[PDB]
């Protein structure tokens, strides 16, 4: 068995191009290579399956929804916040934030992990000596 399918209502990441990082909803499949994808911020358009990545989220719709019906069903299944808090969808968000640390921020993080690094080692020494 597989755990991800191209189908109606499946939400898929756009994993290549100028539009990298957006969630879209597959609303109809044109052929074996091209999908028709609609997201509430964009004009429904056909995209290739090579430029997408199927996620784990699904929403409960008909073929070719109406934008209002699409916007509704996204929130009813809570698409955005699920993507944002799961590990796959959080890796994207942090990797953006890590990019936006200015120099002084990178210094104060550099201070934080040196202190945290010391905590771990002295914590880890006490367990290593307590257990034999």
């Amino acid at each position: 068995p597989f755990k991800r399918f191209v189908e109606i209502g499946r939400v898929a990441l756009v994993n290549y191009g100028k539009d990298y990082g957006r969630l879209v909803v597959i609303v109809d499949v044109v052929d074996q290579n091209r999908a028709l994808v609609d997201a509430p911020d964009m004009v429904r358009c056909q995209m290739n399956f090579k430029r997408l990545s199927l996620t784990d989220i699904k929403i409960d719709i008909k073929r070719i929804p109406k934008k209002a019906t699409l916007i509704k069903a996204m929130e009813e299944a809570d698409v955005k916040t699920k993507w944002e808090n799961s590990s796959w969808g959080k890796k994207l968000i942090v990797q953006k934030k890590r990019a936006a640390l200015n120099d002084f921020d990178r210094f104060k993080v550099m201070l934080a992990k040196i202190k945290r690094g010391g905590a771990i080692r002295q914590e880890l020494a006490k367990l290593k000596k307590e257990v034999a």
Binding site: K3, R4, V6, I8, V30, D31, Q46, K50
Partner: protein, 177 residues
């Protein structure tokens, strides 16, 4: 973005002669990559069908036809005449695309692929939007199925941009469909 091909109405007639101050006006729907190539192909058919050459003729109007509903999926039929290495043939095709411009681009591609036929050798007789329930080809029909579901059996492994390209990697790529 741009479509490689565009649909044009081209309108033209013979030159007014000392008789026939109102020669008859002809129109076609043509496919070409710009207006200039559209006008040139108009005068091709009108020399060999209606016996009016560009020299003795006159160009009246040229307009681009666009798709009314680009956001929806239409089925399409194309009736085409082509030349092989040993003669001429008629061929019919089904395509699925959101615009008829997209449908034509696939057709030229599959003719150059499945038959090694070049664009200067194909004449499009008739184009249509064959509604489903009447599509003939089996490839087009298997997509006329709500509850359509299939996996991605081929999936490209590639960074979002070349900025993140490396040559070496610690672990093997992790793939599952």
């Amino acid at each position: 973005v741009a479509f490689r091909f565009h649909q044009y109405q081209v309108v033209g007639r013979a030159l007014p002669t000392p008789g026939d101050e109102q020669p008859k006006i002809y129109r076609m729907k043509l496919w070409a990559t710009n207006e200039v190539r559209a006008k040139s192909k108009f005068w091709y058919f009108l020399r060999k069908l209606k016996k009016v050459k560009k020299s003795n003729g006159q160009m009246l109007a040229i307009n681009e036809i666009f798709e009314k509903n680009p956001t929806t999926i239409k089925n399409y039929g194309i009736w085409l005449r082509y030349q092989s290495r040993t003669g001429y043939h008629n061929m019919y095709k089904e395509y699925r695309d959101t615009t008829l411009n997209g449908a034509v681009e696939q057709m030229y591609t599959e003719m150059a692929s499945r038959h090694r036929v070049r664009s200067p050798c194909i004449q499009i007789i008739k184009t249509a939007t064959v509604n489903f329930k009447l599509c003939k080809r089996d490839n087009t029909k298997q997509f006329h199925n709500s509850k359509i579901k299939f996996p991605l059996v081929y999936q490209k492994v590639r960074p979002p941009t070349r900025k993140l390209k490396t040559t070496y990697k610690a672990t093997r790529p992790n793939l599952f469909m």
